Each structure stands twice: as C-alpha cells, then as structure tokens.
Design an enzyme around this catalytic site. Structure first.
Site, mmCIF file in Angstrom:
data_model
loop_
_atom_site.group_PDB
_atom_site.id
_atom_site.type_symbol
_atom_site.label_atom_id
_atom_site.label_comp_id
_atom_site.label_asym_id
_atom_site.label_seq_id
_atom_site.Cartn_x
_atom_site.Cartn_y
_atom_site.Cartn_z
ATOM 1 N N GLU A 81 -2.431 -1.799 -12.264
ATOM 2 C CA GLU A 81 -2.250 -1.042 -11.032
ATOM 3 C C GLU A 81 -0.751 -0.771 -10.951
ATOM 4 O O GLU A 81 0.052 -1.696 -10.963
ATOM 5 C CB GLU A 81 -2.695 -1.871 -9.834
ATOM 6 C CG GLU A 81 -2.418 -1.243 -8.478
ATOM 7 C CD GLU A 81 -2.927 -2.101 -7.334
ATOM 8 O OE1 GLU A 81 -2.655 -3.317 -7.337
ATOM 9 O OE2 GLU A 81 -3.614 -1.563 -6.439
ATOM 10 N N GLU A 110 0.216 3.782 1.973
ATOM 11 C CA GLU A 110 -0.462 2.502 2.152
ATOM 12 C C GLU A 110 0.234 1.747 3.264
ATOM 13 O O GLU A 110 1.452 1.824 3.407
ATOM 14 C CB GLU A 110 -0.438 1.698 0.845
ATOM 15 C CG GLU A 110 -0.966 0.265 0.959
ATOM 16 C CD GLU A 110 -1.189 -0.416 -0.395
ATOM 17 O OE1 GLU A 110 -0.769 0.144 -1.431
ATOM 18 O OE2 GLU A 110 -1.792 -1.517 -0.425
#
Ligand SMILES: [Ca+2]
Ligand SMILES: [Ca+2]
EC number: 3.2.1.8
Lengths: 178, 178
Positions: free
Chosen positions: B75, B164
């Site tokens: 990620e 985010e």
C-alpha cells in the site's frame, strides 16, 4: 444477567450471523475480518459461561470473551480457542484460571477502528494453552493478572463472547450467559 | 487516460462523497477513517495531475496519490498534503521531485484490511516537505527512489488521488487526470 448487547462487525465475504436470546450462530467463508457475538452493554466481574461448537475449516478463527475499556482505551481478549492466529505483540507472563494456564500478551493497534472512532490503543490478551469450546471464564482472574503485570484497565464498556475470523470458512453455535 | 476507478471507502460518521468524470468532492465530519477518490484500475508511470481545494478544520487529513501493488502486497502513498498525521514507521531517506523534497517512510500493517482481504503488508510512503493542493506528481521518481532504498514493488493494481481522514471535519474538491 441477560444478554442486552449484540456484537455485529463484518467487512466482507460470506458471514451468516444469527443472534438469539441465549446465544448466537455463525457460518462464514470470508477473506475479511468480522467480530460477532452476544453479551452485555457494560461488562462486569461475573464469570461468563459459554458452550457449543466452533469449527474452523481453514484460515484464522478465534473463540473468546472480547471487550473494551475507556480511559484508558483498551481492547481485550480471553481466547478459549484459536486457530492459525498470528500471535502479535509481547508476552508478559501467565495466569492459571479455569482448568488451564493462559499466556498473557500486550499489543498496540495504531490508527485502528475503535468504540471511540479510529484510534491508537493497547490490547490485553489472555490465550488459553489448552483450547476448549465449552466452559466458564472467571474474568476477574484475568483482570487481576493483567493489572499485576502493568496491564492497566479503565471504565468497563461492552463485553461479549465473540467469534472472529478471516481467510477461510467455519461455523459456530454458542450459548452465552453469566 | 480516463478515470475508470472510484475509490469509496468509509467506516462511519458524516462523509459526503461526490465522484465525477474529472474528479471528486468530499465534505466530512467523522471520527472514523475513510479513503475516497478517483483514478485508474491499473496504475502506471504517467505523471498524475491534481488540483483544487483541501481544507481540514480539525482532526487528521491527507491529500495524496494512493495505491496498491500485488506480489508483494504493498500500500503506497505520495502525500502532497497532510494535517495532524501520526507519522508511523521508519524513515528511509528522501527524494526531490516536482518542486520539493519528500521524506520516505516504510511501515507495516499487521492483519489490516487490503485488496486481498485482511492481511499483513508494508507501506511505502513519500511525504512532501512543502504541502500543496495543486500540482503534478511524477510517480516514477517515487518508484525509483523507493526501489533504491529497498522498497520493492510488485504488479500494479489500482491508483487513485485520494483524501483520507478521521477525528474531525473538512472538505475537498479535486480535479484528477494523467
Ligand atoms: Ca478448536
Ligand atoms: Ca493544507
């Protein structure tokens, strides 16, 4: 007491959870983590009774008394059974309770989902050395052992008997009470 | 290319996400983590353009090129902006790209949700030392810098420009392309 809380957490895949007045049932086949079970809105020192079946065909599967605490924020587990569980954290010691010894671990979850939103908090885990699917869990013995090793708890939040898993399939039919 | 992927992840609270053909919009007020944005089903080396606004009234907020990789599972983030972000992991070095220097970090997420289900994997993060809300991100410069420091990537999976956050409110209106 009387079950007044239903733990129903799941992120994906096939998870068939069926809560009831005296317990719960679950059948799963998923790659994603889920935590389901029944219990109480505010945990206590009352010895928790559980019983039934718990089969893990593949992947990770855990049968345990699960709960939270606030100020400090703490997620705790008292695993009575576990399969393919990636033992994470630091071993702190042991405690002999209810027919077997438990290895105590302390772990930290950074920026993880919690009852307070996504947060960083510690985990106090008691993993039974002799796995079972039926029995009584004298929770105070674990809280005392945890405290004596520096694992400090705060105000009691919910406390359930839960099944958690991922990476495979399995099923469980458990009776819960105290 | 043409946006063909919509990143829409959220766990709770007030998150108003509005995807579009040329970008996205988000207004939030939540305690729980969410990752929203738009991009491509399979990432490439094409320099990604982004622009617009990104306000964080409170809590953690990040504006970055975000993506995944398989075999190994990775990620990655290329943060162009961040507020109250708990810098987790290990610093590896730096890379000067697109008008500023970036501090590279490597982190590990144990038993965390992924495109492969809940798994354990590493994170390759590039945090811009001079935050911005408009610009171009030459992704290859980061992949090269990552590789040179031992941060090994696998097959490219999705790649989006995402916002985010958690622990507060904010808003963002971004234009995405390559
Ligand atoms: Ca067993
Ligand atoms: Ca900013």
């Amino acid at each position: 007491a009387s079950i007044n809380y239903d733990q129903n957490y799941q992120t994906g895949g096939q998870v068939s959870y069926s809560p009831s007045n005296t317990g719960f049932s679950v059948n799963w086949n998923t790659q994603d983590d889920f935590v389901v079970g029944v219990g109480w809105t505010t945990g206590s020192s009352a010895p928790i009774n559980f019983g039934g079946s718990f089969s893990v065909n593949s992947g990770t599967g855990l049968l345990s008394v699960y709960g939270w605490s606030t100020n400090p924020l703490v997620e705790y587990y008292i695993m009575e059974d576990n399969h393919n569980y990636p033992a994470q954290g630091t071993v702190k010691g042991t405690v002999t309770s209810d027919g077997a010894t438990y290895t105590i671990w302390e772990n930290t979850r950074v920026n993880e989902p919690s009852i307070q939103g996504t947060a960083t908090f510690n985990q106090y885990i008691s993993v039974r050395n002799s796995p079972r699917t039926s029995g009584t869990v004298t929770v105070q013995n674990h809280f005392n052992a945890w405290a004596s090793l520096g694992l400090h708890l705060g105000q009691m939040n919910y406390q359930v008997v839960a099944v958690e898993g991922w990476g495979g399939s399995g099923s469980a039919s458990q009776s819960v009470s105290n």
